[PDB]
């Protein structure tokens, strides 16, 4: 599947890194929590804490994120929200 | 509906405030984003920033939260994750 980026406040290279990371997570895990945790932990390590990740087929959200550290995209059957705060 | 608290790291009084707040949000809004935004904005105001809220029928998450500022509960047909970070 190709990611559909629905809303981003993030550099193009970091957006591509987010999609690449989620692609590996989807190969490894079918449980949304595991996908989220894989992505969150990778981004903490590569881009410093503190990241938060929500993965789901049906949810809404309202969050506060550091400027340039927000992406919300569809990949396969899940929506993925990934952002930095704190 | 009575809330079912699934996981909390939060004072009993704040947990009850979270449930009371979500109850008002569910009366006012049917869109998950609006429910989330109502709760997040109320908690920013009452308990200081920075709160984040996810409301959904089907999602997983992995987040980092300040100690004693995390609750995850079911209310009606939605799961609600509310936590403080940053």
């Amino acid at each position: 599947r190709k990611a559909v980026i629905k809303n981003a406040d993030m550099s193009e290279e970091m957006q591509q890194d987010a999609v690449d990371c989620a692609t590996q997570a989807l190969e490894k895990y079918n449980i949304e929590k595991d996908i989220a945790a894989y992505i969150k932990k990778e981004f903490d390590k590569k881009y410093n804490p503190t990241w938060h990740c929500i993965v789901g087929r049906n949810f809404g959200s309202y969050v506060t994120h550091e400027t340039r550290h927000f992406i919300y995209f569809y990949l396969g059957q899940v929506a993925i929200l990934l952002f930095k705060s704190g | 509906r009575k809330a079912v608290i699934k996981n909390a790291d939060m004072s009993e009084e704040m947990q009850q405030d979270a449930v009371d707040c979500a109850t008002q949000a569910l009366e006012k809004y049917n869109i998950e984003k609006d429910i989330a935004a109502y709760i997040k904005k109320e908690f920013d105001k009452k308990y200081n920033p920075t709160w984040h809220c996810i409301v959904g029928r089907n999602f997983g998450s992995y987040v980092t939260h300040e100690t004693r500022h995390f609750i995850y509960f079911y209310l009606g047909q939605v799961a609600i994750l509310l936590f403080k970070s940053g």
Binding site: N58, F59, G60, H65, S85 | -
Partner: peptide, 12 residues
Amino acid sequence: TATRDAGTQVRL
């Protein structure tokens, strides 16, 4: 340290 508030929604 600048921030933004943002909402998301899965829509049918």
